Amino acid sequence: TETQSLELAKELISRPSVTPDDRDCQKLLAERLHKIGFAAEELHFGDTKNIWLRRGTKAPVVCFAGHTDVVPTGPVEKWDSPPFEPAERDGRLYGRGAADMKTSIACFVTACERFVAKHPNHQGSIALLITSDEEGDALDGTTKVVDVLKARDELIDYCIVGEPTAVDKLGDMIKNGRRGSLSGNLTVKGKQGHIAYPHLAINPVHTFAPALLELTQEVWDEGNEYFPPTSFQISNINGGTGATNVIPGELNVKFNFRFSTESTEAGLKQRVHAILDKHGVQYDLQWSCSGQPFLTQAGKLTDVARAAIAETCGIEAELSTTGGTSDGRFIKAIAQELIELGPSNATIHQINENVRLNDIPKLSAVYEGILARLL
Amino acid sequence: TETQSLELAKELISRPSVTPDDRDCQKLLAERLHKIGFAAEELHFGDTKNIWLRRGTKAPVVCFAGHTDVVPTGPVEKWDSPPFEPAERDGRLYGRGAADMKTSIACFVTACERFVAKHPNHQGSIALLITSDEEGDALDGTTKVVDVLKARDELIDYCIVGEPTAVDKLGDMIKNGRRGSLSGNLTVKGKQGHIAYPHLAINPVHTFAPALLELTQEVWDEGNEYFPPTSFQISNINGGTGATNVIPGELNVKFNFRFSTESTEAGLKQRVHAILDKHGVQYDLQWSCSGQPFLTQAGKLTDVARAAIAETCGIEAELSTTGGTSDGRFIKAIAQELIELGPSNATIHQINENVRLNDIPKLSAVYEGILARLL
Ligand SMILES: C[C@H](CS)C(=O)N1CCC[C@H]1C(=O)O
Ligand SMILES: C[C@H](CS)C(=O)N1CCC[C@H]1C(=O)O
Ligand SMILES: [Zn+2]
Ligand SMILES: [Zn+2]
Ligand SMILES: [Zn+2]
Ligand SMILES: [Zn+2]
Numbered sequence: 185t186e187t188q189s190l191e192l193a194k195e196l197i198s199r200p201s202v203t204p205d206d207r208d209c210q211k212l213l214a215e216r217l218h219k220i221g222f223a224a225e226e227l228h229f230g231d232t233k234n235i236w237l238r239r240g241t242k243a244p245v246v247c248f249a250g251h252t253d254v255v256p257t258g259p260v261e262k263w264d265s266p267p268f269e270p271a272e273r274d275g276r277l278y279g280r281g282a283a284d285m286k287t288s289i290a291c292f293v294t295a296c297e298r299f300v301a302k303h304p305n306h307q308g309s310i311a312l313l314i315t316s317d318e319e320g321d322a323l324d325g326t327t328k329v330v331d332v333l334k335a336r337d338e339l340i341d342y343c344i345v346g347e348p349t350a351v352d353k354l355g356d357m358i359k360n361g362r363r364g365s366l367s368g369n370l371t372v373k374g375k376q377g378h379i380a381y382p383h384l385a386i387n388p389v390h391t392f393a394p395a396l397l398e399l400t401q402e403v404w405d406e407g408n409e410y411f412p413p414t415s416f417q418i419s420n421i422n423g424g425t426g427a428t429n430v431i432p433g434e435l436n437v438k439f440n441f442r443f444s445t446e447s448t449e450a451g452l453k454q455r456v457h458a459i460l461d462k463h464g465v466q467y468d469l470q471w472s473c474s475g476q477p478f479l480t481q482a483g484k485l486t487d488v489a490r491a492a493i494a495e496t497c498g499i500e501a502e503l504s505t506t507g508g509t510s511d512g513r514f515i516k517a518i519a520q521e522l523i524e525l526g527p528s529n530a531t532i533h534q535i536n537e538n539v540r541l542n543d544i545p546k547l548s549a550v551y552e553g554i555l556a557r558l559l
Numbered sequence: 560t561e562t563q564s565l566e567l568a569k570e571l572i573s574r575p576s577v578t579p580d581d582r583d584c585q586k587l588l589a590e591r592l593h594k595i596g597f598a599a600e601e602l603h604f605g606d607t608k609n610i611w612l613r614r615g616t617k618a619p620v621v622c623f624a625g626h627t628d629v630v631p632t633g634p635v636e637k638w639d640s641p642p643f644e645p646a647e648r649d650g651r652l653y654g655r656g657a658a659d660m661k662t663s664i665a666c667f668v669t670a671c672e673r674f675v676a677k678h679p680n681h682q683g684s685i686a687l688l689i690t691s692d693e694e695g696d697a698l699d700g701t702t703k704v705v706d707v708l709k710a711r712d713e714l715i716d717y718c719i720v721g722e723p724t725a726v727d728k729l730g731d732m733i734k735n736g737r738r739g740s741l742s743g744n745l746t747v748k749g750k751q752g753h754i755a756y757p758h759l760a761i762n763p764v765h766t767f768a769p770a771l772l773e774l775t776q777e778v779w780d781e782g783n784e785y786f787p788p789t790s791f792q793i794s795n796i797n798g799g800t801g802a803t804n805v806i807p808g809e810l811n812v813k814f815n816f817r818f819s820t821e822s823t824e825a826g827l828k829q830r831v832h833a834i835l836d837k838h839g840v841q842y843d844l845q846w847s848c849s850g851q852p853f854l855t856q857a858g859k860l861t862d863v864a865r866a867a868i869a870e871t872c873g874i875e876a877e878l879s880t881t882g883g884t885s886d887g888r889f890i891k892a893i894a895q896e897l898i899e900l901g902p903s904n905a906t907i908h909q910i911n912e913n914v915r916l917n918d919i920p921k922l923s924a925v926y927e928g929i930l931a932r933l934l
Contacts, residue, residue, distance in 0.1 A: 363755070367803055379792050380738070380817050380883045389793040390775040397772045400765040417754050417806055418764040420799030428742055428794050428813050429883075435796070438803050442755050508755045508804075 188297070189548045190277070190541070192290035197270040197279040201252050204325075206233040206316035209252035209286075213237065213293060213314065220300045222312070227332060232317040232324035236333070239300070240309030244341040246558050247311040248292045248551070249326070249515055251318035254281040255533050263535050276538040284532040287539050288346030289314070291548035298548075299555045308559045311340070318511050326511040334518050342485050342558050343519035344551065345512045348529035349504070354543040355493035355550065357502045359524035360486055361410065361479035362509045363442040366449050366471065368456065373466045376425075376433030388435035389423060395463040399439075399456070404447055410479055411444030411505050414452070444505070445477050475513040478522070479505070484558075485521035492553030496546055525550070563672070564923045565652070565916070567665035572645040572654040576627050579700075581608040581691035584627035584661075588612065588668060588689065595675045597687070602707060607692040607699035611708070614675070615684030619716040621933050622686040623667045623926070624701070624890055626693035629656040630908050638910050651913040659907040662914050663721030664689070666923035673923075674930045683934045686715070693886050701886040709893050717860050717933050718894035719926065720887045723904035724879070729918040730868035730925065732877045734899035735861055736785065736854035737884045738817040741824050741846065743831065748841045751800075751808030763810035764798060770838040774814075774831070779822055785854055786819030786880050789827070819880070820852050850888040853897070854880070859933075860896035867928030871921055900925070 199207035210233055214224040217237055227234040233252075257267040257280050265271040267280035277287070296310060315325035333339070349359050372392045377385030396418075404414035416439065423435035441452050453471060460467060480486065486503060493501045507529075516522050527547060531537045574582035585608055589599040592612055602609040608627075632642040632655050640646040642655035652662070671685060690700035708714070724734050747767045752760030771793075779789035791814065798810035816827050828846060835842060855861065861878060868876045882904075891897050902922060906912045 378883065379794060379815055380790075380881075382790055382792050387775075387792060389771075389796055393768070393772045393775045396764075397768045400762075400768045415755075415757055417757050417762060418799075419754060419803050419805055419807070420801060421764055421810070422797050422799070424793075424795030424797070424813070426795060428815060430794055431792055432794070438799070440754055440803060506755075508753065 186294065186545055186548070189291045189294045189544050192293060193277065193282070193287040193544065194270045196252070196286040196290055197281050198268055200268045201254055201316065202256055203253035203320040204232045204317040206252050210235045210314055210316065213289070213312065217293060217296065217312070220297060227329050229324035229328045232315065234315045234325055234329045236311060236313055236329060238309060238311040242307070242309060244308040244558060245311060245339065246308060246555060247313055247340045247343045247519065248346060249313040249343055249511060250285050250289050250346040251315050251325070251511070252286070252289070253316045253319050254284070255319050258535060272541065275541050277541055277544070278536055278538045280537055282537050282539045283348045283527055283529060284537065285346050285348060285526060287544060288348070288526040288547065291544065292346060292551050295548045295552035295555060299552050303556070306559045310555065310559070313515065315511065322511070327514040330514045330518055340515070340519040341521070343512070343515050343522040344554060345510055345515070345522065345524040346526050347510045347524045348526040348532055349524050350526070350528040352528060352530070353497070353499065354527055354546055355497035355499050355501050357504050358489050359505060360503045361477065361505045362507070362513060363411065363444060363505060364449065364477040365474045365509060366441040366443060366452055367474070368439050369470045370437040370439065371468045372435040372437070373468070374431065374433055374435070377431050379429045379431050382431065385431040387431045388433070391465050392435055392437070395460050395465050398459050398463070402459070404441070404452070405444060406446060407444055408446055410481070410503070411446065411477070414441060414443040414447045416441050443477060445479060449473055449476065475509050478513050478516040480521045480523060483521055485523055488554055488557040489523055489525055491557065492550045495553060496549045561669065561920055561923070564666045564669045564919050567668060568652065568657070568662040568919065569645045571627070571661040571665055572656050573643055575643045576629055576691065577631055578628035578695040579607045579692040581627050585610045585689055585691065588664070588687065592668060592671065592687070595672060602704050604699035604703045607690065609690045609700055609704045611686060611688055611704060613684060613686040617682070617684060619683040619933060620686060620714065621683060621930060622688055622715045622718045622894065623721060624688040624718055624886060625660050625664050625721040626690050626700070626886070627661070627664070628691045628694050629659070630694050633910060647916065650916050652916055652919070653911055653913045655912055657912050657914045658723045658902055658904060659912065660721050660723060660901060662919060663723070663901040663922065666919065667721060667926050670923045670927035670930060674927050678931070681934045685930065685934070688890065690886065697886070702889040705889045705893055715890070715894040716896070718887070718890050718897040719929060720885055720890070720897065720899040721901050722885045722899045723901040723907055724899050725901070725903040727903060727905070728872070728874065729902055729921055730872035730874050730876050732879050733864050734880060735878045736852065736880045737882070737888060738786065738819060738880060739824065739852040740849045740884060741816040741818060741827055742849070743814050744845045745812040745814065746843045747810040747812070748843070749806065749808055749810070752806050754804045754806050757806065760806040762806045763808070766840050767810055767812070770835050770840050773834050773838070779816070779827070780819060781821060782819055783821055785856070785878070786821065786852070789816060789818040789822045791816050818852060820854060824848055824851065850884050853888050853891040855896045855898060858896055860898055863929055863932040864898055864900055866932065867925045870928060871924045
């Protein structure tokens with residue numbers, strides 16, 4: 185039906201907002217929604233731009249959240265059409281950010297427009313929480329805006345993060361949470377020496393081997409109705425001097441857990457240390473946690489999104505926690521219920537990123553359906 | 560007693576014959592031994608210098624073998640006295656090559672001088688096989704000279720390689736053979752992907768882990784009266800893109816066997832392949848063999864060196880095959896019996912390399928003792 189969502193998505197995709205630059209996407213959003221009574225609050229931090237746009241002063245507060253930054257395109261000539269000149273081809277819209285996640289943003293802005301026109305006196309409030317750094321280190325984006333909101337007791341009842349969540353067809357999957365991510369940087373200590381005198385050296389690959397095996401065979405947990413089993417995966421392993429006749433004196437290993445609520449950050453660290461210690465490994469281990477798992481169990485928000493998807497798309501949406509993470513991990517601190525909902529994530533962060541054209545007005549009509557069922 | 564060995568060792572150590580340069584060490588040897596009837600045959604190949612010096616035309620042929628090249632010194636200011644200005648200090652002679660292996664060469668040249676003076680009409684022949692590349696890739700040194708000798712049926716009955724073999728005191732250890740060295744370069748194949756979708760990737764660290772453990776726990780053989788058990792050791796392991804949220808698509812591992820005659824090159828390769836295949840690992844594996852094990856069992860030559868050491872040094876020498884390897888692995892093809900015998904190897908290839916001064920005339924008197932018992 186409407187082509188306003190498509191037209192706005194094109195205009196957004198045409199701006200090369202590679203992290204953390206915004207290229208005035210947030211200005212364009214702010215000025216457009218100002219016309220139907222969204223107040224704009226700019227929250228810049230370091231080189232990152234953020235905005236909190238809000239219509240209304242009372243509960244329930246429904247927030248759309250998302251990012252105007254996009255990942256680099258890589259060599260442009262490898263693309264079939266230029267990444268920042270959105271093109272319609274074979275029933276798809278192609279461009280960097282077409283899926284992740286400018287089309288969602290456009291769809292939400294138009295849903296707000298249609299909803300407010302139909303229901304000028306609706307109850308509650310509608311807000312957008314938009315960052316120009318989700319894709320980078322994200323130290324100065326959403327997480328800083330959330331802290332500001334929380335410090336002034338400006339809380340959210342329902343949040344929809346517009347990340348692409350579909351497997352294939354729009355609405356087939358929504359996310360009601362994500363795994364936490366806990367990473368370790370392990371340095372196993374041995375003693376370097378000539379390879380032909382192994383009794384005078386300590387080979388850190390050999391001392392690590394029995395622990396490595398136990399770690400990669402370990403069952404961390406069962407998962408549950410909402411989460412898959414916690415996952416351990418080694419990303420990098422490096423040891424040696426490059427000489428083929430030397431035993432190295434240390435070995436570096438980097439690993440990560442994507443963990444469910446069935447396990448805790450402290451529990452996992454303890455188990456790793458205990459595995460390494462059981463096998464007599466000598467090491468340094470530095471940990472870093474980029475996020476705790478978060479979960480909105482079945483409730484009004486999940487029911488509403490499901491009903492909206494059933495009405496617009498004709499399919500039964502699956503709730504999921506799989507994949508990576510998003511800025512929902514920050515926003516959940518101030519949102520009582522939060523989900524993520526957007527188009528297919530199949531082509532994100534890749535050349536020839538795209539979204540099906542027929543999915544664009546459908547997405548907006550889903551978001552408009554949600555607003556109508558909550559407000 | 561005599562100080563001729565010391566004086567010649569100094570003169571040799573003063574020439575900076577870093578591989579494959581000889582700095583005229585071989586000329587100095589050739590001209591000096593020419594005076595007592597050694598004929599000199601220069602055998603240059605590529606950038607390496609070699610010489611075969613020989614007195615006599617009949618069996619038994621006793622050969623001293625060794626190298627005039629030395630390893631780099633590293634930053635000179637870290638040395639206590641300059642590496643190519645031999646110094647006497649605290650009862651030691653210090654300099655690059657003092658132990659490995661110019662002092663041996665000097666000691667042998669003086670032993671020849673004293674032996675020929677005492678026994679001008681001795682039977683048999685005395686030869687020196689000297690290279691300026693043992694320490695490097697050694698493609699153009701001893702191995703090419705041996706091929707020349709073998710092609711003209713010029714064989715050796717008894718060979719003494721002047722490598723430093725002592726643990727501490729001169730004569731405490733002689734080598735009657737060495738382990739072979741068989742190296743593998745393994746590339747384990749997986750499939751790269753985002754770490755949070757492990758079921759869509761293949762982690763080559765994880766597929767390798769059970770094989771790694773089995774390899775580092777494997778007992779290859781028992782060893783025997785002459786050899787220690789065969790030894791497997793990983794030298795290098797590298798995999799990953801540097802990103803902590805990516806599963807890598809491959810893993811490189813470099814490993815080495817120092818193997819005894821109880822195992823064969825082909826047998827070891829087979830066992831490795833079978834371990835990797837039992838665990839379903841997918842990989843490429845390139846092998847390289849830099850040497851087969853070699854062994855002179857107890858016989859005239861070992862008995863003679865032992866008796867000479869007992870007479871000169873007053874101790875019972877141990878036969879050994881431990882450590883790295885030497886150019887005996889080439890010369891054994893043309894020498895019926897071969898041993899290695901020299902001073903302490905404790906400080907070889909290190910800063911402040913040295914030899915005990917009292918060991919220098921003793922070494923020469925050992926070599927002279929050997930010549931007298933064989934010729
Ligand atoms: C929310 C992010 C896009 S910014 C996402 O969906 N990712 C990022 C990595 C993989 C993929 C996924 O979770 O499926
Ligand atoms: C024959 C060589 C010196 S060129 C040697 O003894 N090496 C070389 C590496 C270690 C040490 C050893 O075997 O003990
Ligand atoms: Zn993204
Ligand atoms: Zn995104
Ligand atoms: Zn050496
Ligand atoms: Zn040497």
